[PDB]
């Protein structure tokens, strides 16, 4: 289990995907040139997981860039690390998706889907032992959502033995451009339930509320939100990119955090919260990080862990700190708060330590929770979907592209079936 193939689809997918490379690249000492100018060789021991080696002592991300709108490849190539992606791995159309899931899933995205698969096959046949795939996308748009779910399904059919893992941004009125997003997200969630092994729910509602109320940014920008997404994505993948034992590869993490196949939607969090460049702070200590890590205000999914029960939890501390300093605290959380961890999964909170901290901070902690409180996120989406669907608003947009009205009622029933499954295990007892 060595190589990971990263894919980014749509404007949100490619934007947050780019921020991911800019950040992990600097932790790994790779410059915009692919030349490694780092300061230690733990940055190299496991760099094959996300980078290919290009024979001139250069490093190339194992990344595929996809979007039906050509506008945003102009975008990414412009970025700080714009010119280190393989030009041949830019698969872009000219007609966009128009924020329409059906267009991305069925018509314009389906015309481009196997051009994308060709590049995935090229990447995968060069891997010694491919672990699986990592997709970054939005669920509220048309390309990231529609085509992204199509790509998941067809990648699944071609690589049934590998792990599929997604970083899915959920729509929110606080940040939204259109009212059709509950349609696109509800149609997307249906395919994520069936065809993904792990999904990180990065809720734009939570990202906005964090910037708006805790970091006191009057008008959050997309770049403000992505600063939080970049740090989360960097934290949750620390154990994949650095020598470790717990959660060391994509399948080992999945085996530990997913007790039931469909309940694989995680609620990520991260401490401390900084704003872009204002990060200089007092220090923070181990007891504080532990409690901020488990704090609702620190999650990037707009749900209260206190309103449900943890099925599994993964914690990643970063930086030079006392570890059993850490092991006293995270065992204290569990016994004082015994009622919020299910009794029928013993030892369901695992702790990892990585001595390499992120840029700008000497100590950090990342939270990965599989909580039954995640129902709140899907119930929020289900209510908006139903509100629109009951008045059948703008369904002509979807039917006109070759989709059926009963796929909407089916999506509605599958989201609600997911909701019911969580509440079933939230009330269950060891007995």
């Amino acid at each position: 289990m060595r190589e990971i193939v990263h894919i980014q689809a749509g404007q949100c997918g490619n934007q947050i995907g780019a921020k991911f490379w800019e950040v992990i690249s600097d932790e790994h000492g790779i410059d915009p040139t692919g030349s490694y100018h780092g300061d230690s060789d733990l940055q190299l021991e496991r760099i094959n997981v996300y980078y290919n080696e290009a024979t001139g002592n250069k490093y190339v991300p194992r990344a595929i860039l996809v979007d039906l709108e050509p506008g945003t490849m102009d975008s990414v190539r412009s970025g700080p690390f714009g010119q280190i992606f393989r030009p041949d791995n830019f698969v872009f159309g000219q007609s966009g998706a128009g924020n329409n899931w059906a267009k991305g899933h069925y018509t314009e995205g389906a015309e481009l889907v196997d051009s994308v698969l060709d590049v995935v096959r090229k990447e995968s046949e060069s891997c010694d032992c491919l672990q699986g795939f990592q997709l970054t996308h939005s669920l509220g748009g048309g390309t990231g959502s529609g085509m992204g779910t199509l790509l998941i399904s067809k990648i699944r059919e071609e690589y049934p033995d590998r792990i599929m893992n997604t970083f899915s941004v959920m729509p929110s009125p606080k940040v939204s451009d259109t009212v059709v997003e509950p349609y696109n997200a509800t149609l997307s969630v249906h395919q994520l339930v069936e065809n993904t092994d792990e999904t990180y729910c990065i809720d734009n509602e939570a990202l906005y509320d964090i910037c708006f109320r805790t970091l006191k940014l009057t008008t959050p920008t997309y770049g403000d939100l992505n600063h939080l997404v970049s740090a989360t994505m960097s934290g949750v993948t620390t154990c994949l990119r650095f020598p470790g034992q717990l959660n060391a590869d994509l399948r080992k993490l999945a085996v530990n955090m997913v007790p039931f196949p469909r309940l694989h939607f995680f609620m990520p969090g991260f401490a401390p919260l900084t704003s872009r460049g204002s990060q200089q702070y007092r220090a923070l200590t181990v007891p504080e990080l532990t409690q901020q890590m488990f704090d609702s205000k620190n999650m990037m999914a707009a749900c209260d862990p206190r309103h449900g029960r943890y099925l599994t939890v993964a914690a990643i501390f970063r930086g030079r700190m006392s570890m059993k300093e850490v092991d006293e605290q995270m065992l204290n959380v569990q016994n004082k708060n015994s009622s919020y961890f299910v009794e029928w999964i013993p030892n369901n909170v695992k702790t990892a330590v990585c001595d390499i901290p992120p840029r700008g901070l000497k100590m950090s902690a990342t939270f990965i929770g599989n909580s039954t409180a995640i129902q709140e996120l899907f119930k929020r989406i289900s209510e908006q979907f139903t509100a629109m669907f009951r008045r059948k608003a703008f369904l002509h947009w979807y039917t006109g592209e070759g989709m059926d009205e009963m796929e909407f009622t089916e999506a509605e029933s599958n989201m609600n079936d997911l909701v019911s499954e969580y509440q079933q295990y939230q009330d269950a007892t060891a007995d």
Binding site: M1, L246, K252, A254, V255, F260, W344, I345, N348, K350
Partner: protein
């Protein structure tokens, strides 16, 4: 020669294996490149250390050892470590994709891509043996390789070597160091499918070793290297009789005779004393009486349980160093004047004794002090059913909701195997209840 082949499976098995063979090499005066200047024989021989070491014409002593993992990370360290030149390079066998803490992957899907190669390599070792006794197998309970592949290997070794003995050293999981929540499942699954293929199995509770490292060696955060070294000195005490002249447990057959009255209840408890920190190099001698009495204090046990609340079926004392037999006999004499050690009706309520007068070896760079005398007590008591019960209770809680079961049925296993494995473990628990009045 009456050879013994050691097989190490999974990370825990491999890394414990490399600790042991390091220790063996020091006890037998073998150098990191295989050379032993203290050996008169030209390029071979029939000494007792030849049961564990083959000999080549250049005077190179080669472990009769196999290292197997389904990913290369750990075994790659053996290939490049201090003892890179000691082992048969073809006996270091790896895949590329591990079992992801999934018994079903280790025993059914991933494990069976490499099982036939593993057996052909063991055959090769067995074909260099004058009179192969059997195998010592190291593995963890909670790893997908440690549980699944190990169980698959034991089933195959039974078919191709029906005559030979098989001994287990199994790492019993502990939350302190546990990497996965499904370790209780894997523990039950392998125990069930392995029970009928193993003649005797020594469980090593990682929590017990963890506590000893903290309490006796004053180590804040025990590392695997810390636990391994301590474990490999307990393992050495148990295999010393096979590699040295002695009168107790001289071959694998005798392990069964002395420790296992009935085939199913074959998990002896090991207790080891003294464990003294290397910072106390000027500690005063502990007598035969004191280290013998320390073998009945729960703190020094390898598996957490209460022998005083159980009943003994067998007890063997393996002393090392400056140990006068008459002092041993008098130490036992007072031990049998303690009413809390009950024996079953149907067995001789005495203690078998062996003494190896070499002073115990400890690794340079370890955390243990050098001692003049040490003892490893191997006792088959019914108290060890408490350890199975702890695992069974965890198994029951998760399997009640079928948590994580899909991972297993998706990798070649039938769901019915859970319940039958748990029924076999329920039958084992009542096996212990029936033996213990």
């Amino acid at each position: 020669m009456r050879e013994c082949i050691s097989i190490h499976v999974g990370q825990a098995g491999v890394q414990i294996g490399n600790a042991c063979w390091e220790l063996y090499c020091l006890e037998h005066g073998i150098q990191p490149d295989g050379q032993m200047p203290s050996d008169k024989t030209i390029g071979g021989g029939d000494d007792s250390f030849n049961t564990f070491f083959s000999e080549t014409g250049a005077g190179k002593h080669v472990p009769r050892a196999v290292f197997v993992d389904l990913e290369p990370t750990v075994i790659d360290e053996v290939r490049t470590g201090t003892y890179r030149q000691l082992f048969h390079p073809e006996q270091l066998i790896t895949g590329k994709e591990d079992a992801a803490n999934n018994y079903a992957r280790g025993h059914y899907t991933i494990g069976k891509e490499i099982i036939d190669l593993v057996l052909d390599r063991i055959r090769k070792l067995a074909d260099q043996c004058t009179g192969l006794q059997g195998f010592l197998v190291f593995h963890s309970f909670g790893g997908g390789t440690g549980s699944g592949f190990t169980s698959l290997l034991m089933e195959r070794l039974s078919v191709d070597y029906g005559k030979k003995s098989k001994l287990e050293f199994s790492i019993y999981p502990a939350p302190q160091v546990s990497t996965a929540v499904v370790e209780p499942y894997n523990s039950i699954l392998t125990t069930h499918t392995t029970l009928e293929h193993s003649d005797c199995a020594f469980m090593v509770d990682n929590e017990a070793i963890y506590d000893i490292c903290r309490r006796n060696l004053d180590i804040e955060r025990p590392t695997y290297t810390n636990l391994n070294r301590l474990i490999s000195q307990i393992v050495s005490s148990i295999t010393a009789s096979l590699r040295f002249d002695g009168a107790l447990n001289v071959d694998l057959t005798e392990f069964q005779t002395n420790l296992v009255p009935y085939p199913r209840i074959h998990f002896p408890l090991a207790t080891y004393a003294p464990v003294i920190s290397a910072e106390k190099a000027y500690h005063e001698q502990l007598s035969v009486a004191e280290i013998t009495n320390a073998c009945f204090e729960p703190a020094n046990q390898m598996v957490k349980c209460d022998p005083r609340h159980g009943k003994y079926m067998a007890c063997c004392l393996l002393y090392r160093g400056d140990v006068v037999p008459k002092d041993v006999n008098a130490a036992i004499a007072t031990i049998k004047t303690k009413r809390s050690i009950q024996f079953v009706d149907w067995c001789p309520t005495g203690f078998k004794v062996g003494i190896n007068y070499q002073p115990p070896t400890v690794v340079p760079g370890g955390d243990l002090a050098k001692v003049q005398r040490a003892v490893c007590m191997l006792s088959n008591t019914t108290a060890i059913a408490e350890a199975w019960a702890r695992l069974d209770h965890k198994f029951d809680l998760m399997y009640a909701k079928r948590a994580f079961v899909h991972w297993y049925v998706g990798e070649g296993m039938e769901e019915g195997e859970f319940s039958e494995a748990r029924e076999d473990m329920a039958a084992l628990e009542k096996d212990y209840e029936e033996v213990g009045v």
